[PDB]
Assembly symmetry: D3
């Protein structure tokens, strides 16, 4: 069968791996993006200011990974929003909405027991390289 | 490269979005379905009767989204079952089994800390548009 | 449209299903693998020794499912690591690292409230059948 | 035999073009490519060449191709290659004046040359390849 | 050169059909499409035309195509287009009586016409295109 | 018309090969397959056959194909089928001696035969099919 493209996505505009994973993997046309915490890309540290600031940084991180793969947020087809606190759902929703102009992805969003580094939010995503009709 | 089909799936036979997401996204042949709670499609409210009733409604909701995309449960390849209580695993399993006549999907099933709206169960799914061999 | 290959993956070298799911589903070239606990394939029981032993068994289980589908760990593109305890992240990371020689998958890793059978870890994965470039 | 996708193979058949009598089809669509049998200036109803020589024949042949394309959900914009077979190379310019009426832009690849003889005494035969849309032209 | 999938390109080669001597292959499979070099009524063992004229030649040519299809994991049901080249248009009916024996249904697209000359003095040459299965016929 | 992928269809055009004047393109790339119009031994600059007979013409024709392949991001290793049309079957060996210079291994499928006449009085015309890489040869 055809040999499908498989490319590790890696940019210094997103945080370095603090464990055994790639930022994202592009395979054929689908990009599987690792869960992103609200880590400042230069320092590798959670940004201050709690869940809202962290959500903004996490989504910014995803945006830079998408850009490295020739995509933007319009390429995203599914996301998962992992919360440390379900009471933050409204606040996180309002952040998240700002990163999608259109064609809102499929999503699941819920509270887990704990995230790495005591993050308040982690977002994973799936995207498909364009062109998309 | 080819421009792949990307279609937002939306039916009034499933609940309206109470946040910034689509019910499902079809991209090429893969359908990414949002996490469904046991919400009555007409009202947008959780059905009464607890985890069993909610699981039935959530899976019914998924079925209507699949139908909107020209599919049924035989198109589903993976599901995730998110529980508010791991003690409900048996009861939810017996509900879930009724929606698959065959070719049971891959699955993961476990307890999270909280779901939106105080749901007792949420189910996400991945499907592939047929024909399938 | 073309009729895509859809094959239920099933091997006696991985645990039997204790519920209504397949070990994995191959659909076109993508393999959706069910969440694996650290269950001994012969007995269906969690191996003793806690999170480290369980992680090793879970990943071994995934390896046998990949082998049944003509793949190995280099085919994996995404994994999710579900922990019963976020303090086990380091220990689980060191186990997990041993199963990837290269091209580390995308990943998300975090603590949930409870796993089936009181497992300490569950790992799901997504793979793509080769050849991969 | 089941480890790769099963690709669509559709037999095209329309009463609006000469019937394909014997062990051939008017066209075969397979995956997205349509292979169209060479068409002569044969009248579908009569089973004979239309009168009036190479120009009338070219018109009927291209009409025939058009009806086959339509049966496959396509039109002339789907054509990516055509071969124009002639009884006389010196009829090329006159056949080209017919042919150019069917194409606007993004023209098919083409070969045109003279053969020793065509079926039915034909003076022109056109074979085409097309690709089922949608197509994005660059 | 690495940003798109690398498609399979397989050279077909079988001792059961005339050897392809010089810078050509008996057939090339690329992705799922098999392009088969035109086959004459050449005996594989002798390297010459079989005796007995156009009918014997057509049988050998189609036998040759069959062995090449088999080498590519296919049979005659995989064929989607064929071209029948003749030394004499008036041999069409007799060659067609041979050809029809190889196909049952879902027939290939076809063109048949007379050329000025074929290699080796041949009276018939058949070129075919096939698509590696599985195929779903509609 | 939007429920299947929209496949790329690219018109190939290069000044380095004879211009395609009238309702045809030098080549069409569609999905990954390139259909290349038959090329004569025509000088691009002059619009006429090069002098010196069939051997000089074959060289120019293959040079023409080369420039078209290059315009489509390909070279001769991308070619999967070619057809060699001749004014004289007895020129096959001499044209083959030219042709073999363009191919090293993994040769295209081929048909070669004599036609009654080619455009422009040509003695050789070559049509080719190619597939945009990357390609994995087995
Ligand atoms: Ni198969
Ligand atoms: Ni490339
Ligand atoms: Ni469409």
């Amino acid at each position: 069968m055809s040999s499908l493209v498989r490319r590790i996505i890696s940019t210094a505009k997103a945080p370095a791996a603090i464990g055994p994973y790639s930022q994202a993997v592009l395979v054929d046309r689908t990009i599987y993006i690792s869960g992103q915490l609200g880590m400042d890309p230069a320092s590798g540290q959670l940004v201050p200011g709690g869940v809202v600031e962290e959500a903004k940084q996490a989504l910014t991180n995803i945006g830079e990974i998408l850009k490295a793969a020739g995509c933007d947020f319009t390429n995203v087809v599914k996301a998962t929003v992992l919360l440390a606190d379900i009471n933050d759902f409204s606040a996180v929703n309002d952040v998240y909405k700002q990163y999608f102009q259109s064609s809102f992805p499929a999503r699941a969003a819920y509270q887990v027991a704990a995230l790495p580094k005591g993050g308040r939010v982690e977002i994973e995503a799936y995207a498909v390289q364009g062109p998309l009709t």
